[PDB]
Design a protein around this ligand. Structure first.
Ligand SMILES: Nc1ncnc2c1ncn2[C@@H]1O[C@H](COP(=O)(O)OP(=O)(O)OP(=O)(O)O)[C@@H](O)[C@H]1O
Ligand SMILES: [Mg+2]
Lengths: 19, 268
């Protein structure tokens, strides 16, 4: 769950394995 | 063979799945290089071949914004890929660290990436796995040179001929055409460049969900926007490029060459 804020959405950015 | 003859290993720089990257020096030349050491012994010959394919492709690619491969060596139980040393860590890490980039820095960065992508494409190579994790920074300074890495999933196209080259990449950065299990080619990399630019500007990706099935429904439907407050300040030009990169049909999508001519990259 993210809020409607820039600071919140910036938590959506994590590293991702392939496939 | 002759690796422990010519080079000498120092500190670890990172672990991968099957691998370990370590700063090494060519003892005759006195030249620093990054050495990715892999375990032959933990690997079937089918996967020995998968690796010697990665090296073959990496050595077609001499470019200022592509980690050049200087040598590739098979010893008993180990394989050594000698890359350009890049000390400034992943683009991903530096984006997290700086929260987001200024348009001016983001432009200077995406420009270099597009250059790299273009050279790949004109050499008949599609990366299929562009993301900030696979871009190394020359240094941790503000306008630094960015070279492109891991062609572990890179493929060879004959000209503009599209084809089903299999379902591969990273879920965040996959093209509609790949999820839809349609044939594809160079445009898949320009879609990724769309994602990467967006991240570059505001510090999060245009498509996300913890449940992967939704994340995919998002991508297929071209379901991105420019939220407030943070996107309100960002020039409409920057938006336009992202819109032409995240064009959902791949034939109407902007090419690496078209992208490099866009006002937001070539201004003044
Ligand atoms: N040429 C290099 N110069 C400096 N550091 C590097 C270099 N190549 C890799 N590294 C560092 O070590 C890490 C190793 O990445 P590596 O490619 O081994 O990842 P992986 O998880 O094995 O996946 P893949 O091998 O498919 O890319 C890089 O992300 C980076 O942090
Ligand atoms: Mg990696």
């Amino acid at each position: 769950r993210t809020l409607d804020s820039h600071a919140s959405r910036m938590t959506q950015l994590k590293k991702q394995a392939a496939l | 063979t002759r690796f422990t003859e010519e080079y000498q290993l120092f500190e670890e720089l990172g672990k991968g799945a099957f691998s370990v990257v370590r700063r090494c020096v060519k003892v005759l030349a006195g030249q620093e290089y990054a050495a990715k050491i892999i375990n032959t012994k933990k690997l079937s010959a089918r996967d020995h071949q998968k690796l010697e394919r990665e090296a073959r492709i990496c050595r077609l690619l001499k470019h200022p914004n592509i980690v050049r491969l200087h040598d590739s060596i098979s010893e008993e139980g180990h394989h050594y890929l000698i890359f350009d040393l890049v000390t400034g860590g992943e683009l991903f890490e530096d984006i997290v660290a700086r929260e987001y980039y200024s348009e001016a820095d983001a432009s200077h960065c995406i420009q270099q990436i597009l250059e790299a992508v273009l050279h790949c494409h004109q050499m008949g190579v599609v990366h299929r796995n562009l993301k900030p994790e696979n871009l190394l920074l020359a240094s941790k300074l503000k306008g630094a040179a960015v070279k492109l890495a891991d062609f572990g999933l890179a493929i060879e196209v004959e000209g503009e001929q599209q084809a089903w080259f299999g379902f591969a990449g990273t879920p965040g950065y996959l093209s509609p055409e790949v999820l839809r299990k349609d044939p594809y080619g160079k445009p898949v990399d320009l879609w990724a460049c769309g994602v990467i630019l967006y991240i570059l500007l505001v510090g999060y990706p245009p498509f996300w969900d913890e449940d992967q099935h939704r994340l995919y429904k998002q991508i297929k439907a071209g379901a991105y926007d420019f939220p407030s407050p943070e996107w309100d300040t960002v020039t409409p030009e920057a938006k336009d490029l992202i819109n032409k990169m995240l064009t959902i049909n791949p034939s109407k999508r902007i090419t690496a060459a078209e992208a490099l001519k866009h006002p937001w990259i070539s201004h003044r």
